[PDB]
Amino acid sequence: SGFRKMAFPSGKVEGCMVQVTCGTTTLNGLWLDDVVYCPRHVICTSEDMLNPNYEDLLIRKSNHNFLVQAGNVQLRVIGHSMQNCVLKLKVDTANPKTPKYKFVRIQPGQTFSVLACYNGSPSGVYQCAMRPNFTIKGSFLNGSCGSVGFNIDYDCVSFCYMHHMELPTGVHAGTDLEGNFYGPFVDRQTAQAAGTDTTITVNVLAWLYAAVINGDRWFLNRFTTTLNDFNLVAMKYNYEPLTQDHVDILGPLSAQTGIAVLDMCASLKELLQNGMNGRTILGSALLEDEFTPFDVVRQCSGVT
Amino acid sequence: SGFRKMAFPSGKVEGCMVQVTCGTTTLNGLWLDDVVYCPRHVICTSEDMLNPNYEDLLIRKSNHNFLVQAGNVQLRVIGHSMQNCVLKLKVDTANPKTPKYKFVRIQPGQTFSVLACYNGSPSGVYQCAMRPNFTIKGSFLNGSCGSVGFNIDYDCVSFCYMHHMELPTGVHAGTDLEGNFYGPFVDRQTAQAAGTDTTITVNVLAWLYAAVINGDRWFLNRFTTTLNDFNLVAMKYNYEPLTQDHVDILGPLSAQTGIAVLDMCASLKELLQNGMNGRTILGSALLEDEFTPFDVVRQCSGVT
């Protein structure tokens, strides 16, 4: 039936995007109820970004300095406050398009959709994973700050990410919706170390199960392994160590395919040690890790 | 800044999806104005699909046999007609969420977003290309028929695809919104030949320009080629022959990067003849062809 890097339908989030302008700077905001959320660096100029004192910069700002526009209508700002690295602008009107929502802080290795926006207008949607080093490999340009990451369960949107910064390496950093950065990052124009990244082992295994379900079975072999033997291979190839918690999460996929998790680990071990020999798996020439076991179950069952 | 396989924001299309049921069969429909569009095979049972006489099957059906539901509200069907492989159900209510739209028949090699749906409810969104052989490599299960492909320009949705069928090979076939199949396919449960597919050369080149813009430059070399010399390599590797029309379309990317199109062809020639030697380009270990030159310009400039 096929397998694609699928994002959630973005409609519920599109109806929340607004443009926030403070003096010279314009970025995106998320309008939920009567609050607009945006990166606090909207109050900076390029000269400030080198080492900003956000508290002092925000003191020079009043409610009337924040211009919030939803499509073409201007919102009236009646309160402003800084929570960690986000600003919360109280407006006099609740968003009539506010979906059922939650703010969640996702774990590294989990996936989410990003609705990239410019001037409060959506441009596109893509699926990605929060890397084990708390960076994301997105697609963002100047003006995209304030774009958010989310998951959708039934009718409830769980916002997990707000885009803030591009590291000098081209990878992306941002916060949860409480303004706490994922990783060691600070909202400052300084060179910042992103830790060593690893491949999300449980996600690669989940994707190997997706491949078997969709017919790509060439990599299945006559071997098995143990968690300890497999983890010696995972360490050499910079893969996250596999735990029984990971094996347990792969249980639904093992029950459906009839392939024991450690037998799939032995396929992955051989792929790590021998490569793909010029072959592909689900249209990829590398081991894909941005699909969780839940994503595989969801896509392979047709959950809406 | 990064480069991702980005889909259009699906909100405008989500508001058009409905569930259509005819007797035992349920699939998705697209509600635009007072017409609901869906695959005509909604009128078949499994016994009919082997060799259906759609004209005769549709004669046994009246307006009241088509159950159309938009979320939780029932639409009143007042007319029904078959146009090629699609049914058009006239309803007594115009969709209040109908966006500015057009029906377009896209060309092979062009890209579009798919909003996969089940029971009239969206599950996800992904970007894909209409293959040169008029198939699409999507992600669809039973119940996904009627899901549509589209492009968005400013505020206008151009619907180009309606999903109808999975070939025994696992690839997908469907129609334009006038119900004309792309390719030689017929809506019948018979083994059907999809032609030999080729790699979309102009899209690979566009993606190589996207890689240079985003820093991946290892593949650039000290060589050049000619259209005729390059096309001898394209034929051997099952790539579409490059024409001056393709070179002309790559003009904006050549002007921005300062790399002449034939110099980029020489990089592609060497990649075809030598492989990637275990290296990657924009996170891929293979040559990607599902990004048009327009897609690259759009993503790299931030068009909303």
Ligand SMILES: Cc1ccncc1NC(=O)C1(c2cccc(Cl)c2)CC1
């Ligand atoms: C230009 C760009 C591209 C992609 N994503 C984001 C950006 N923007 C940035 O990085 C900016 C910045 C600078 C330093 C630290 C922080 Cl928190 C933010 C706004 C200028």
Ligand SMILES: Cc1ccncc1NC(=O)C1(c2cccc(Cl)c2)CC1
């Ligand atoms: C089951 C499925 C999976 C993915 N995409 C689509 C489907 N559905 C089909 O192919 C069906 C069919 C059969 C033969 C010809 C035609 Cl036009 C349609 C409905 C049963």
